[PDB]
Amino acid sequence: GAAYGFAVKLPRRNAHFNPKYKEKHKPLGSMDWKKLQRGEPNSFSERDELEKKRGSSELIESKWEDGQSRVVGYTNFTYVRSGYVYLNKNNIDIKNNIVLFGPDGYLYYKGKEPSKELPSEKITYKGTWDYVTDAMEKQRFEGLGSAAGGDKSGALSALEEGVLRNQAEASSGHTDFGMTSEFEVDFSDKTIKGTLYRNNRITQNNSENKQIKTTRYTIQATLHGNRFKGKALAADKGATNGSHPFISDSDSLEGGFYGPKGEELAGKFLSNDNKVAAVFGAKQKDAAGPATETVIDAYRITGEEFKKEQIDSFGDVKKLLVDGVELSLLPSEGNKAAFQHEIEQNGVKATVCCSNLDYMSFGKLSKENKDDMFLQGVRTPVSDVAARTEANAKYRGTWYGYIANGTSWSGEASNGGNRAEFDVDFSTKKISGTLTAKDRTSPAFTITAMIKDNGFSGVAKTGENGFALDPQNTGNSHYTHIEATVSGGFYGKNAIEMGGSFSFPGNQEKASVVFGAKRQQ
Ligand SMILES: [Cs+]
Ligand SMILES: [Cs+]
Ligand SMILES: [Cs+]
Ligand SMILES: [Cs+]
């Protein structure tokens, strides 16, 4: 349920003189978060609206920076942008009826190329985080500063007074700046620990308070896909001084990894008391060698061309992306579930299988009237597959296929129809299998493969005599025989399912096949 990125509009209560036009409180909520679609991290709908609204000059965007809020060494982010984007344009409607003071903008986080590949060991990510509060009348946090508002405005992190930003302080390699974030991730444990800090500018003679770093939060999360869900723990849960709105925790912490190898990550959370909404983004340090592995497979087989086109995935099998917009693969008002179930949702139309599979979905899709064949699924990584030492698995499932020369023929998944048996022998890693067509005696495709990592690779060939496109009508039965390279992966919790595909172009006969099966014996 977690998407590309999110943005919450920076709260500005209607601080008007009061013929009942004055807004008492401009609170925050989960419904005040708005979702961001595909594109570049440093640009989206509302931000473009800001750019249009901009005009003469002056756009404030939290990049880095290099003036406030950065960690040196964990410098440039290519896949992720998280922070604040606002404008100093106040809203005035003496033409009735509006009065808005403070930053007109959004607190967002956005990433591109969701990770289908993650490290297999402990990796630390450093970065930054930013917050914003609601707009309550006569609400001020002395610890944050009056310049931060919180009356009329909503206490923006970019305006927190007693923080270090300018880098002139300690001209050496002083690393952390402003509100920094630190994370340690154990991918083998599927666990994420974190801490949201606050770098203090130790006053010239250190006047009234305060030491180097104020621990604002900690973070506890777990993985399931390429995203992470969990809780944010406020360090000052015992607070009543009213010095800062970091009193309550947050059971609404969501996030995700970005980059092909998962070299970046970003997320958000909203405090339980609906007082503080916060975002964060972190990457690794500056011929790198982090041991990695694939966790998510998600591709379309173009129709026809040749190869496969990789498509974005969040680990949610129940829906897919077409590079543009979301496509739900669940039956609604049509009644679940049978085996296969096709759906159309405005932009395109598709058919998805099946019911016996929970960790993977595969089928066909259409828009250009040249159908492609998608396959997606969350793999079963990785030491679980490696440690497995059985003797014979015997997977069983089915497949979507298309063979043409011409003449052209296609086959769909069945519940005597299209079937697919697979024999997996661990310890030796050797796997064999066959997939058969509709009402036909002999196997259509024989697949021989072997297991590496959390996947399997091999070859699929037709019968010795070939595969007749027209078994009946003997003259030009079109015995098209095809030998191609088939690649697949193990999807599930205990590798209870498997999937894969193979395609083939030529300088005259073409083909494309996707398949999925379930472990039983
Ligand atoms: Cs404080
Ligand atoms: Cs204010
Ligand atoms: Cs200051
Ligand atoms: Cs709480």
Residue numbers in the entry: 43 to 328, 335 to 463, 466 to 557, 563 to 576
Lines from the paper:
Neisseria meningitidis is highly adapted to its human host and acquires necessary iron in the host environment using specialized receptor systems that sequester iron from circulating host glycoproteins; notably transferrin (Tf). TbpB extends from the outer membrane surface by virtue of an N-terminal peptide region that is anchored to the outer membrane by fatty acyl chains on the N-terminal cysteine and is involved in the initial capture of iron-loaded Tf. The current study was initiated to explore the sequence and structural diversity of the TbpB and TbpA proteins to gain insights into the covariation and coevolutionary correlations between the TbpA proteins partnered with each TbpB isotype.
The overall approach was to develop structural models for TbpB and TbpA from strain B16B6 to compare to known structures of Tbps from strains with isotype II TbpBs and use this insight to provide a structural context for exploring the sequence diversity of the receptor from of a large collection of N. meningitidis isolates. The overall structural organization was similar, consisting of two orthogonally oriented lobes comprised of N-terminal handle and C-terminal barrel domains. In contrast to the isotype II TbpBs, the loop regions of the handle and barrel domains of the N-terminal lobe were fully resolved in the B16B6 TbpB structure. Similarly, there was only one unresolved loop region in the C-lobe of the B16B6 TbpB compared to four in the type II TbpB structures. Although much of the core secondary structural elements of both isotypes are nearly superimposable, there are subtle differences in loop regions and a tilt of a helix in the N-lobe handle domain. The primary differences between the TbpB isotypes are present in the unresolved regions of the crystal structure where there is poor electron density in the maps found in the linker region between lobes, and loop regions of the C-lobe (dotted regions – extended description in Supplementary Section). As revealed by the structural study with the B16B6 TbpB, the most distinct differences between the isotype I and isotype II TbpBs is in the linker region and the C-lobe region where the large loops are reduced or absent in the isotype I TbpB. Isotype I variants also possess longer anchor peptides and shorter linker regions than their isotype II counterparts. The anchor peptide is observed in a locked conformation bound to the C-terminal amino acids of the C-lobe via an antiparallel B strand exchange, while the remaining anchor peptide wraps around the C-lobe domain.
